Design a protein around this ligand. Sequence first.
Ligand code: 2PG
Ligand code: 2PG
Ligand code: CL
Ligand code: K
Ligand code: MG
Ligand code: MG
Ligand code: MG
Ligand code: MG
Lengths: 436, 430
Amino acid sequence: AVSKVYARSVYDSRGNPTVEVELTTEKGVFRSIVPSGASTGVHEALEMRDGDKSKWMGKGVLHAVKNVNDVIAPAFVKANIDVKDQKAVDDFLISLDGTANKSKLGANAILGVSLAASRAAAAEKNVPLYKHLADLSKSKTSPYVLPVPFLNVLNGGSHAGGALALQEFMIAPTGAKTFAEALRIGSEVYHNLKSLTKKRYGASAGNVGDEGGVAPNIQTAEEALDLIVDAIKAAGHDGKVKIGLDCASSEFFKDGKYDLDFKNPNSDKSKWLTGPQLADLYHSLMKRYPIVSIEDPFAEDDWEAWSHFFKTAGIQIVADDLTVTNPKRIATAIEKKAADALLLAVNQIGTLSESIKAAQDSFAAGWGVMVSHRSGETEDTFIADLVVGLRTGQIKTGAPARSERLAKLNQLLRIEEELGDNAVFAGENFHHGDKL
Amino acid sequence: AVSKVYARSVYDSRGNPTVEVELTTEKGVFRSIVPSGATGVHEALEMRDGDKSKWMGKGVLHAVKNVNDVIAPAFVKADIDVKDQKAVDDFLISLDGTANKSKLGANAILGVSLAASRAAAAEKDVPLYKHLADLSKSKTSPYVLPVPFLNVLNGGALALQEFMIAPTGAKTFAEALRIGSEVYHNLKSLTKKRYGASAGNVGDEGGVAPNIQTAEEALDLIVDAIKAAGHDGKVKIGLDCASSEFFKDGKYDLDFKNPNSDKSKWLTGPQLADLYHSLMKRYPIVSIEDPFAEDDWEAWSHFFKTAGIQIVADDLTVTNPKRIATAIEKKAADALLLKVNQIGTLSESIKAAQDSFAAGWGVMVSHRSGETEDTFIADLVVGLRTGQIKTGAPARSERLAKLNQLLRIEEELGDNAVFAGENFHHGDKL
Ligand SMILES: O=C(O)[C@@H](CO)OP(=O)(O)O
Ligand SMILES: O=C(O)[C@@H](CO)OP(=O)(O)O
Ligand SMILES: [Cl-]
Ligand SMILES: [K+]
Ligand SMILES: [Mg+2]
Ligand SMILES: [Mg+2]
Ligand SMILES: [Mg+2]
Ligand SMILES: [Mg+2]
């Protein structure tokens, strides 16, 4: 029985308020925290903010919290839905709000209750969270599949001060044999990268972006990718570490064009690229560097550019702002063959149930699924258990720096240990990890 | 009954491996993680593998092994009562058998020490901070909630390492944190405006690190930030000089990042003190940590004569009751920076705090620069009733995890807690 549901304000990794929910049963008190994006897709479910300029830079979540405590809480406690029944739980919450985009209560009011319920269920059942999430998703547990970590070791775009347009430069130790090995290798590459970055672009280059990657003030990707390929070599993990990009191209899509200097107020509109032109630059990058995944190469509604690029890409193409973990928009992307991987970000859609549906739909269409953090993260570790539960074989939860990232990576360490011989490391099979 | 003690490697906020310990009883499995400094020469031994081919030489396999291979079987055989933190840490301390914990390693022992206290709280069915109050014979009516010292700016051209803000003017911790976060964001905005976008990217502790020449420029910047946020008069400043970092040939080099620093312009103890006093006169500074080197006793004592604000010992005392006794003897400082992993056990850490308090000292509980998702010090600072803590800027969740835990503690305690505010120095005496 759910005796209590309670929400408070806490702080994310950028020092902005966000919603924390506590769900009390006889099994104890269960806590989930909602993350917060910076490069948020326009189609994402509502993140409700106070916009009281006198408090928290206008970023209060008092209203969201109040919606939990004054609206959802009493109705949820009164109903006492079986927490084990995630569908009915999320069913209830979504109906309480009664809008498509969760704009009545706010996604950041509902998600906390959704996630906390699933934690409570796992306890009731006497099973690890990833196990219960496996159950929820009807995923195979024999073996489990452990994810390749995609480590955003070099931050640009809206995640770091500097010229670099593309948002995330990730390394993916697919050549590793275990997660633990992959994390060691990733940390070694990161440290070697940090040293080379300082030497190459100055000590200040070694300071980190929002997601823990070094933040050199450089103008082009090709400059970023040189640093990483040099770092991989220096760490002596050549051929065992691939690269992944999040372009977050929606952040510099303007006037049907793409601004590769969008953080320059004096950017040259002459040198803004067309879809084609941009497609060209990517293909050059793909040719020169060991890139195995590219996320949001084109804009959240630039469907034609996705379709045309995907035709001849030949690597994993991840939809993020395109699909915003929305089963509706995933259906479109599948139809148009715009991508073959989904970025799963639970607070984009606002319930676990909906997030699991998006995953299941993607897998069914032969997509991959990369579970993701937000750039605004917390000490919450839910997506570590999620990626394992969902058997996706790939996650991206930050550089190996800043503990809102390490928290997830550490939790994955612990899960791999627990699972022992009943887990495989997805490694080179990350794309179709579920099919393993 | 403790039925297993176990250790694994995990990664700290800088992506370096560290020791995580799990202690198992009939109440379940209880977890503690060891932090890591970037360290006083007198600190208990942090044991690293030094295998250049692994983790940049920073592996902790040996320490983990020491937990699993040496401490673990003996501890279990010992049938220790985790409720008795003293018996716990005496066993551990005895097992290692060395003054500075160099046989098994400080980072092997501390995890067991902390996990035991978590297990003890559970057995008693009390919150951790409550158990820690009991262990330390601290008053709980009311509890005292800490002022957060937030590390918003870092140095080290400008030679001073840490520049913190302390919302002592707040009426609750919750209000303190909000005010702190607002100042921090305003400072970040001003920094990028004044020193370029890249200068907004954070350091190891989540603070900004603009290329600044002088302390004054760093303090003026912070003053502007506090004003911009509209909290002028409600927010004070704290400093961590980490002067050992620029202590050379019996002198202090304020320009110790310049290879050709004018050696003739290196300061004497009395000279540096003159600088601090000028800074202290012009800015709302209410606390200064390690203003002199970790064995420059004469320099501390001299300064302490004329200083009118809290003077914290860190590298000087390294949370060691033996060195704190000296510091008290010499009238070198009047506050202890409590870093549990500097001495290695909870019991010695509590002993250090108690010796400090008994000598009229303050105690600032503190993180290390390499932190984890572990939130022990949040419960510890409340348990010890010290009234002040420093656990990072309000960014990076190895910092926020602690400050969030304090929000929860404050909410839980309701009317049975006071915010130390202006009275942080003698918070324990509140
Ligand atoms: O774009 C992304 O993929 C996410 C995760 O890194 O970032 P943000 O939460 O800022 O949108
Ligand atoms: O000197 C200090 O005060 C500590 C905490 O800031 O730093 P470090 O853990 O690197 O010793
Ligand atoms: Cl006193
Ligand atoms: K002994
Ligand atoms: Mg985004
Ligand atoms: Mg993205
Ligand atoms: Mg130090
Ligand atoms: Mg210090």
